[PDB]
Design a protein around this ligand. Structure first.
Ligand SMILES: CC[C@H]1OC(=O)/C=C/[C@H](C)[C@@H](O[C@@H]2O[C@H](C)C[C@H](N(C)C)[C@H]2O)[C@@H](C)C[C@@H](C)C(=O)/C=C/[C@H]2O[C@@H]2[C@]1(O)CO[C@@H]1O[C@H](C)[C@@H](O)[C@@H](OC)[C@H]1OC
Ligand SMILES: [Mg+2]
Ligand SMILES: [Mg+2]
Ligand SMILES: [Mg+2]
Ligand SMILES: [Mg+2]
Ligand SMILES: [Mg+2]
Ligand SMILES: [Mg+2]
Ligand SMILES: [Mg+2]
Ligand SMILES: [Mg+2]
Ligand SMILES: [Mg+2]
Ligand SMILES: [Mg+2]
Ligand SMILES: [Mg+2]
Ligand SMILES: [Mg+2]
Ligand SMILES: [Mg+2]
Ligand SMILES: [Mg+2]
Ligand SMILES: [Mg+2]
Ligand SMILES: [Mg+2]
Ligand SMILES: [Mg+2]
Ligand SMILES: [Mg+2]
Ligand SMILES: [Mg+2]
Ligand SMILES: [Mg+2]
Ligand SMILES: [Mg+2]
Ligand SMILES: [Mg+2]
Ligand SMILES: [Mg+2]
Ligand SMILES: [Mg+2]
Ligand SMILES: [Mg+2]
Ligand SMILES: [Mg+2]
Ligand SMILES: [Mg+2]
Ligand SMILES: [Mg+2]
Ligand SMILES: [Mg+2]
Ligand SMILES: [Mg+2]
Ligand SMILES: [Mg+2]
Ligand SMILES: [Mg+2]
Ligand SMILES: [Mg+2]
Ligand SMILES: [Mg+2]
Ligand SMILES: [Mg+2]
Ligand SMILES: [Mg+2]
Ligand SMILES: [Mg+2]
Ligand SMILES: [Mg+2]
Ligand SMILES: [Mg+2]
Ligand SMILES: [Mg+2]
Ligand SMILES: [Mg+2]
Ligand SMILES: [Mg+2]
Ligand SMILES: [Mg+2]
Ligand SMILES: [Mg+2]
Ligand SMILES: [Mg+2]
Ligand SMILES: [Mg+2]
Ligand SMILES: [Mg+2]
Ligand SMILES: [Mg+2]
Ligand SMILES: [Mg+2]
Ligand SMILES: [Mg+2]
Ligand SMILES: [Mg+2]
Ligand SMILES: [Mg+2]
Ligand SMILES: [Mg+2]
Ligand SMILES: [Mg+2]
Ligand SMILES: [Mg+2]
Ligand SMILES: [Mg+2]
Ligand SMILES: [Mg+2]
Ligand SMILES: [Mg+2]
Ligand SMILES: [Mg+2]
Ligand SMILES: [Mg+2]
Ligand SMILES: [Mg+2]
Ligand SMILES: [Mg+2]
Ligand SMILES: [Mg+2]
Ligand SMILES: [Mg+2]
Ligand SMILES: [Mg+2]
Ligand SMILES: [Mg+2]
Ligand SMILES: [Mg+2]
Ligand SMILES: [Mg+2]
Ligand SMILES: [Mg+2]
Ligand SMILES: [Mg+2]
Ligand SMILES: [Mg+2]
Ligand SMILES: [Mg+2]
Ligand SMILES: [Mg+2]
Ligand SMILES: [Mg+2]
Ligand SMILES: [Mg+2]
Ligand SMILES: [Mg+2]
Ligand SMILES: [Mg+2]
Ligand SMILES: [Mg+2]
Ligand SMILES: [Mg+2]
Ligand SMILES: [Mg+2]
Ligand SMILES: [Mg+2]
Ligand SMILES: [Mg+2]
Ligand SMILES: [Mg+2]
Ligand SMILES: [Mg+2]
Ligand SMILES: [Mg+2]
Ligand SMILES: [Mg+2]
Ligand SMILES: [Mg+2]
Ligand SMILES: [Mg+2]
Ligand SMILES: [Mg+2]
Ligand SMILES: [Mg+2]
Ligand SMILES: [Mg+2]
Ligand SMILES: [Mg+2]
Ligand SMILES: [Mg+2]
Ligand SMILES: [Mg+2]
Ligand SMILES: [Mg+2]
Ligand SMILES: [Mg+2]
Ligand SMILES: [Mg+2]
Lengths: 136, 49, 74
RNA sequence: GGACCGAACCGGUGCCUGCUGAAACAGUCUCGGAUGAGUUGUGUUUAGGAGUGAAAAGCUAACCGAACCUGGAGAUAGCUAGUUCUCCCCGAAAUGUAUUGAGGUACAGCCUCGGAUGUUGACCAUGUCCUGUAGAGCACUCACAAGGCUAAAACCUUAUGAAACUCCGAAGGGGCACGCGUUUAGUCCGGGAGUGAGGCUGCGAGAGCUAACUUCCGUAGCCGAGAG
RNA sequence: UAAGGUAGCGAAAUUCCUUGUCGGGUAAGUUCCGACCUGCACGAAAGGCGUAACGAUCUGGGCGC
RNA sequence: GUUUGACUGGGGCGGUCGCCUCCCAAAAUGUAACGGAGGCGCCCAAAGGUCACCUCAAGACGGUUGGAAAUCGUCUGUAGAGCGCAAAGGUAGAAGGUGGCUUGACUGCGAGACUGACACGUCGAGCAGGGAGGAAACUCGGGCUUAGUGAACCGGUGGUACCGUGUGGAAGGGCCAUCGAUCAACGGAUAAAAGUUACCCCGGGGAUAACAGGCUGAUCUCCCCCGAGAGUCCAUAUCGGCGGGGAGGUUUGGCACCUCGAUGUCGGCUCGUCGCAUCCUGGGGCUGAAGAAGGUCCCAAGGGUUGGGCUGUUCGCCCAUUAAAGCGG
RNA sequence: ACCCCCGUGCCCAUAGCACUGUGGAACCACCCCACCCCAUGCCGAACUGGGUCGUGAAACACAGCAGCGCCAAUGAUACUCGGACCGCAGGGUCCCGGAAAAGUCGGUCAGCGCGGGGGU
């Protein structure tokens, strides 16, 4: 969720992601296919769904993180003073980027958990078990 | 109030002045420099004014 | 909280393999991205200018330390 | 009797009608006063920043926050309109900086004409130099995911984000020379300008909801002034 | 701050929240009457509070038609 | 008699107006926004000239006051420091820290260049007069640079001996220094200036607001996906957290496109007509549907959809009915 | 001519660090002494002035070595001038040249002058 950090506001455009195409932690991983912002409560709902389905057990990693501030001008004004101070934090997400990955849960239950979590994300997404991997 | 005033320096028996802002903080005692005036070579200009 | 900014043109002005007349300005820079070479002089703002007419030429070694210099004609 | 009802008379309450009227303020109906601070005739006096006014800025000869007439006077009009006979050649601007400036104007920029030089212009190639964007990466700053060690900080494995981070870093872009090669402009001097409200789309960003036939910059092209 | 409302009146030609809350009137009352006071931002000759009579005054009811 | 700025996603209120630094800025320079951050209107007779010397932050182990950080000692240690103020470049063969002597924080000049429409602004070899430090080569015409600012006019002061009205003087003026500017709206209208108009007038504008239409759909209205739980029991009879996706264009809005040489605006009345996301009636599925009375979803727009009190009201509350007392164009 | 030392440059990390070995009476170095030239904001530690011996202890010089730094390919990809497209949009594709960063293969503990001293 919200970071405790630095400059309030930013900008925006896109290109395919590089910083995490492969599933390092855990066994399985759901993975993004579209370039939307993800932001805060969207993730946290993914987290709370999977933690319901799995917890008492399993290991849940959230490799994505609401870095990027996004702004809302007030109410109903004209293009006025500056931008709007707050609103929500997002994480940009490009295809092949891994958002989620379970540990210690059978293949089928990871299927169902990824299905639930992905039914509330702006992007469609595909899951995979980790092929052979390199990058260490 | 004011702190570092502008100080004009009469040359030692010359005819010309020089003018600069000697800060009145640490520079409590009147300026005595040397400079080339109307006539000879560098001489003592007494920045009293 | 926004209105402010300011506009001071800077950069290399006389590039390598150019024939500077002496007293020409060859680079304006804020620090020492270029260090004045053989045949070059540097003023208060670290401007590099020709000391004598010649071919401007650049020596590059490691971007801590490169130098502009003049190789006179004749 | 600044009493009552009520004609004349003075008035003008509400509705309708009239609205290129019968009338530039009226008509029918209804209504107020009606011996009083009353109504009315003749003569006469007060006027323009002036008169009058039981006071609305009312009235002062049918439209008074300062009458009419003549004159200054063709006031001034950074504003709106309009600006007429023909064919021929070239041909823009809606940018920059400044402005009690922002739909105005000065200078520059871009147009045209005459003179001078007389290939210095254009494109594309080679040589050379400059640059920190795209990407990428965590070596610094900030942020940040799972473990280890541990008085948590640092520090180890694994793992990320970046307009205001950068160990790195292109494609392109700019200057210079040369023409090794094709083309045809260029520069200087002097007369006349207009333009300084731009518009769309693709690409690159900001503001905005990664809204707008949206807004402000950059860049290419068309409209502008281009019919087919 | 120089002081901080004496009588009187108060949801008012003043009240924003508002159709305040209670009651009266009505089958039903955002209006109107009466009470209360919490007076957004009443009040004593820019007068306060009353007042018979008057009014082509404005507001709410009733009878008659 | 006049004054009573401008910007301005209409104007007003608020904010801003000059200067420096970074991002925006698309690897040349330049580049707008009421884009995103931050500073200046100074300071220093030494923080300057020069000449000599020294080298930082931080950590670990060890030690009197101490007890995480003070002071001292060893080790590691391109800088993780420092540089008067902001940030950026630069910087250890120092521009950093310390001492010596000192004023070049000079006069007269200025080859040649950066930068600007102009006027300004920047750098600068080298020449003379005369100095300062060094033994010397040599360095010095303020500061590590980049902000610390103001044309002209009019005047104060000190030199100079150009002008000076018949002549010689003097008054007055000129030339060289130099004092006076939040003239900050910071290229600066006068030496000198605030409000109000619903009594208002003129010239203009759809270059620009209010209505409506348009574009958009944040807000509004409506429908869909998932399914956590509720429903004793069962997620889906009904309901549906946290989240996701769409439609409509009836709300408040954004934007400013036609209309400012006029497109009359709320409500009522009158007259209609259309959509359907259906209030009633008509047909269906499912039900936590026995019957009856219902719930909810699907089909369906033929027709129908009351009279009053209050209020300008639209709404909404109420009275008394109703098959129903539909929502919008 | 061969060897090594003392200086000193070009090049300044493929030339630097760490572990290790070898050098002393040539050379350098520590070392001895210091009232004074000279000097430490206290200390001859450093500057400094007079010299053996001793010792190569530390330093420095040279040699080994690839633990660490530093260099760093090929293949491919990112991105992209140019050309032509798709998607309502975020965003994506194709042909043509250009072509990284990182990482893998590997490469290195330099290379090149001038002088003077002393050896053989
Ligand atoms: C009907 C009576 C009079 O009109 C009006 O009051 C008004 C008429 C319009 C509606 C109005 O328009 C509107 O303006 C608005 C500002 C805007 C609006 N837009 C949205 C369209 C527009 O609609 C006006 C300004 C239009 C304009 C031509 C005008 O000035 C007309 C003036 C006079 O002729 C008319 C009269 O008819 C004359 O009646 C007089 O009445 C007296 C009592 C009589 O004694 C008699 O006088 C002797 C008689 O004759 C004079
Ligand atoms: Mg992309
Ligand atoms: Mg791409
Ligand atoms: Mg990676
Ligand atoms: Mg009477
Ligand atoms: Mg009358
Ligand atoms: Mg009459
Ligand atoms: Mg009567
Ligand atoms: Mg009477
Ligand atoms: Mg008067
Ligand atoms: Mg009249
Ligand atoms: Mg007449
Ligand atoms: Mg008049
Ligand atoms: Mg006229
Ligand atoms: Mg005249
Ligand atoms: Mg006038
Ligand atoms: Mg032509
Ligand atoms: Mg300017
Ligand atoms: Mg203009
Ligand atoms: Mg012109
Ligand atoms: Mg010509
Ligand atoms: Mg030319
Ligand atoms: Mg040519
Ligand atoms: Mg990037
Ligand atoms: Mg590398
Ligand atoms: Mg030719
Ligand atoms: Mg001309
Ligand atoms: Mg002409
Ligand atoms: Mg313009
Ligand atoms: Mg434009
Ligand atoms: Mg935004
Ligand atoms: Mg537009
Ligand atoms: Mg035009
Ligand atoms: Mg055409
Ligand atoms: Mg054209
Ligand atoms: Mg056509
Ligand atoms: Mg009441
Ligand atoms: Mg009220
Ligand atoms: Mg009752
Ligand atoms: Mg009641
Ligand atoms: Mg009323
Ligand atoms: Mg009452
Ligand atoms: Mg009162
Ligand atoms: Mg009073
Ligand atoms: Mg009274
Ligand atoms: Mg009273
Ligand atoms: Mg009366
Ligand atoms: Mg009335
Ligand atoms: Mg009545
Ligand atoms: Mg006048
Ligand atoms: Mg204005
Ligand atoms: Mg402000
Ligand atoms: Mg640039
Ligand atoms: Mg560029
Ligand atoms: Mg511009
Ligand atoms: Mg911004
Ligand atoms: Mg120094
Ligand atoms: Mg000397
Ligand atoms: Mg000089
Ligand atoms: Mg004088
Ligand atoms: Mg005389
Ligand atoms: Mg005189
Ligand atoms: Mg200005
Ligand atoms: Mg003035
Ligand atoms: Mg003024
Ligand atoms: Mg009034
Ligand atoms: Mg009037
Ligand atoms: Mg008018
Ligand atoms: Mg018009
Ligand atoms: Mg318009
Ligand atoms: Mg305008
Ligand atoms: Mg209208
Ligand atoms: Mg409206
Ligand atoms: Mg509108
Ligand atoms: Mg219209
Ligand atoms: Mg939605
Ligand atoms: Mg609208
Ligand atoms: Mg526009
Ligand atoms: Mg018309
Ligand atoms: Mg209106
Ligand atoms: Mg239907
Ligand atoms: Mg049914
Ligand atoms: Mg039944
Ligand atoms: Mg009804
Ligand atoms: Mg009634
Ligand atoms: Mg209807
Ligand atoms: Mg040596
Ligand atoms: Mg050793
Ligand atoms: Mg021997
Ligand atoms: Mg010793
Ligand atoms: Mg040894
Ligand atoms: Mg390759
Ligand atoms: Mg090509
Ligand atoms: Mg392309
Ligand atoms: Mg290719
Ligand atoms: Mg590589
Ligand atoms: Mg070695
Ligand atoms: Mg030799």
């Amino acid at each position: 969720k919200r970071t405790k950090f630095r400059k309030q506001f930013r900008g925006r455009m896109t290109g395919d992601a590089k910083g995490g195409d492969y599933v390092a932690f855990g066994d399985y991983g759901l993975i993004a296919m579209e370039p939307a912002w993800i932001k805060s409560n969207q993730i946290e709902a993914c987290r709370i769904v999977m933690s319901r389905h799995f917890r008492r057990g399993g290991k849940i990693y959230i490799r994505i993180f609401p870095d990027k501030p996004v702004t809302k001008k007030p109410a109903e004004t004209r293009m006025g003073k500056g931008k709007g101070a707050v609103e929500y934090w997002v994480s940009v997400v490009k295809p092949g980027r891994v958002m989620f990955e379970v540990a210690g849960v059978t293949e089928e239950q990871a299927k169902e958990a990824f299905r639930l979590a992905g039914h509330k994300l702006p992007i469609q997404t595909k899951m995979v078990k980790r092929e052979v991997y390199d990058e260490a | 109030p004011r702190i570092i005033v502008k100080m004009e320096s009469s040359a030692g028996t010359g005819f010309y002045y020089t003018t600069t802002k000697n800060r009145r903080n640490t520079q409590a005692k009147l300026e005595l420099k040397k400079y080339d005036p109307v006539a000879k070579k560098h001489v003592v200009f007494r920045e009293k004014k | 909280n926004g209105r402010d900014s300011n506009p001071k043109y800077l950069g290399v002005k006389k590039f390598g393999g150019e024939v500077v007349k002496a007293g020409n300005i060859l680079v304006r820079q804020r620090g020492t991205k270029f260090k004045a070479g053989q045949g070059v002089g540097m003023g208060r703002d670290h401007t590099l200018f020709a000391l004598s007419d010649g071919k401007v030429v650049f020596i590059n070694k490691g971007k801590g330390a490169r130098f502009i210099s003049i190789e006179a004609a004749q």
